[PDB]
């Protein structure tokens with residue numbers, strides 16, 4: 001495997017920071033004019049994280065269509081993702097409006113609400129079955145139907161109802177609860193077990209709208225998740241691990257949203273996760289059971 005030789009060269013020479021700096025230097029810069037309009041200042045969580053105009057998601061709303069969210073369209077892989085920031089208290093209605101309008105089936109949350117003593121995301125889903133949430137600004141009702149709590153992640157089944165039309169949809173919420181901000185998962189096994197649970201749910205299927213992926217900013221942990229999933233899909237289509245250039249894929253994804261992957265360690269972890277996941281792609285389905293056991297999910 002050529003990425004496995006690349007990994008060893010970089011690791012033994014301690015070069016991860018230099019490689020990551022090269023990526024930052026080569027990454028695309030496109031206008032983000034809409035994000036910076038004064039009327040949108042309170043729709044952005046971080047001043048330095050903005051969607052590009054060309055790939056931003058537009059709300060179907062005539063007053064103000066802005067949400068801090070980007071469509072990542074991986075044409076070669078035939079998979080799309082919506083990456084967004086953790087919603088703010090005033091944007092939780094916009095968040096669910098986007099989910100509705102884009103026909104998403106799953107939401108992947110890679111952060112906790114409180115991290116490092118600060119609030120990184122609003123509580124945007126209900127905590128109890130009998131206490132539904134109503135978003136008066138966007139006319140949606142959200143109900144918790146069930147939750148399956150594991151040791152390091154939680155899966156929730158939510159019902160989203162459009163109060164204008166009375167039509168309902170089931171949304172799956174996949175919540176990774178042990179991935180630190182600016183950090184990496186505990187092991188490739190834990191990460192891959194979680195990714196494959198998302199895959200197996202059908203949420204990434206082309207018959208649904210794009211999956212919504214977020215962390216606090218929608219770039220660091222979110223980018224790591226999407227990079228690994230896309231690389232494994234590209235390897236699967238070709239059945240050729242040596243045709244996937246992880247750095248080129250990341251640069252392609254950065255055409256659609258700035259800043260994807262925020263540390264050299266997250267880049268290094270992306271390699272490890274793709275190298276380990278390749279074992280399943282190339283025909284050893286038993287590794288998936290090993291990942292579940294090493295993840296201590298139960």
Ligand SMILES: O=C(O)C(=O)Nc1sc2c(c1C(=O)O)CCNC2
Nearest residue numbers: 046181182215216217219220221262
């Ligand atoms: O949640 C992530 O993984 C992520 O990218 N977080 C990010 S990226 C980013 C910040 C944060 C943050 O959480 O403080 C602070 C502003 N600079 C960029």
